[PDB]
């Protein structure tokens, strides 16, 4: 339709699209310690071989 808010603010569902392109920001806060990744890879190999 017509009669849009050309000057004031983003409103309605244009905020939702921000969620859809802010979720990528939440997906990169999931930090991890590298040395824990190497530790767990090592213990995984050892437990997978077995005897």
């Amino acid at each position: 339709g017509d009669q849009i808010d050309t000057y004031e603010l983003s409103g309605g569902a244009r905020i939702n699209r921000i969620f859809h392109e802010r979720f990528p920001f939440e997906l990169v806060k999931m930090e991890f310690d590298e040395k824990e990744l190497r530790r767990e890879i090592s213990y995984a190999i050892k437990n997978i071989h077995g005897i």
């Binding site: 017509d2 849009i4 050309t6 699209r17």
Partner: protein, 50 residues
């Protein structure tokens, strides 16, 4: 939705917004012309009649 192609209301609503600013001077011009017409009618009536 997502912005693939430039929309046509991005043009139409900015133009419609700027065009509305024209109402004011257009009505000033009409007031000025009525001022002159009243002036001339006063000149004609002053000059001729006693």
């Amino acid at each position: 939705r997502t912005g693939l192609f430039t929309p046509d209301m991005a043009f139409e609503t900015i133009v419609k917004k700027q065009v509305k600013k024209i109402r004011e001077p257009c009505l000033k011009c009409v007031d000025m012309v009525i001022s002159e017409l009243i002036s001339t009618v006063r000149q004609c009536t002053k000059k001729l009649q006693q």
